[PDB]
Amino acid sequence: XXIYXXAKXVXXXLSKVLXXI
Amino acid sequence: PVFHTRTIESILEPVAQQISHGKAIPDLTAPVSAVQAAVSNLVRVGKETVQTTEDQILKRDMPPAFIKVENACTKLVRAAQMLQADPYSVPARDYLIDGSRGILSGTSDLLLTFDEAEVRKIIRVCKGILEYLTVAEVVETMEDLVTYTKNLGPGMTKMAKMIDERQQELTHQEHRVMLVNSMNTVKELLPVLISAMKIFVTTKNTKSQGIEEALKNRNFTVEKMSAEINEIIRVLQL
Numbered sequence: 001x002x003i004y005x006x007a008k009x010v011x012x013x014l015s016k017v018l019x020x021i
Numbered sequence: 022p023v024f025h026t027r028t029i030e031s032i033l034e035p036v037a038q039q040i041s042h043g044k045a046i047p048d049l050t051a052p053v054s055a056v057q058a059a060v061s062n063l064v065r066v067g068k069e070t071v072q073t074t075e076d077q078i079l080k081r082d083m084p085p086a087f088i089k090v091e092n093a094c095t096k097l098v099r100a101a102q103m104l105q106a107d108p109y110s111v112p113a114r115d116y117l118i119d120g121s122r123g124i125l126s127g128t129s130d131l132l133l134t135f136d137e138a139e140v141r142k143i144i145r146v147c148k149g150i151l152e153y154l155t156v157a158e159v160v161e162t163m164e165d166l167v168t169y170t171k172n173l174g175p176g177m178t179k180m181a182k183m184i185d186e187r188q189q190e191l192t193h194q195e196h197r198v199m200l201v202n203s204m205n206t207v208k209e210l211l212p213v214l215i216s217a218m219k220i221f222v223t224t225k226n227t228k229s230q231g232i233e234e235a236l237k238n239r240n241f242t243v244e245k246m247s248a249e250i251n252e253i254i255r256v257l258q259l
Contacts, residue, residue: 003131006062014124017117019039
């Protein structure tokens, strides 16, 4: 479903924030 | 805790690990802004899935999950603002932490909720076969058995293919093995039931006393098949 791709796009985004500490 | 489903795991495991935490914190507005865009899109898809579904449980459980990641993303957007003013701000440090934590939880909740929806669909496929087994006791002619086999044949098939595709997805192994066994038992037991019925119908249309016998092997087979399908349903929910 579209749900999975959207959730992954939030998971990725969030990772990039955290990989900056 | 372990994400069941190989799919939820690939989505949430990388970041669940990272969320396992000083001095300088660089300027997070660019990245935090990409989280904010993605969570807006998630809420979008959520609302859609809600108005589009016929599942009552999905309708009341999914919204509280968008909201949770929505308010959690707010905490992240604000923690950035703050950290730009004072990179050493201890407040800001915590909003970022709780902010991310909230985002992990809500997303996870949202998916746990969506996964339950898919399981009910599957559960209902099973209940269909369970219904149609209770109708076995009314077949008395030899041409009514032909009707029966024609409907249940393909029905068992659909169930099998779909349980099979479901188990491959679970990330727990015992659960995977319980399903596979139970679907095998039921599949082996189908020709047994037909043969059982075929015997009943013949023993009836000929009148031969061993009909007490035939009727109870038929029934025993219906029961063993039902006991298993209920077991498939139970396991589906773990």
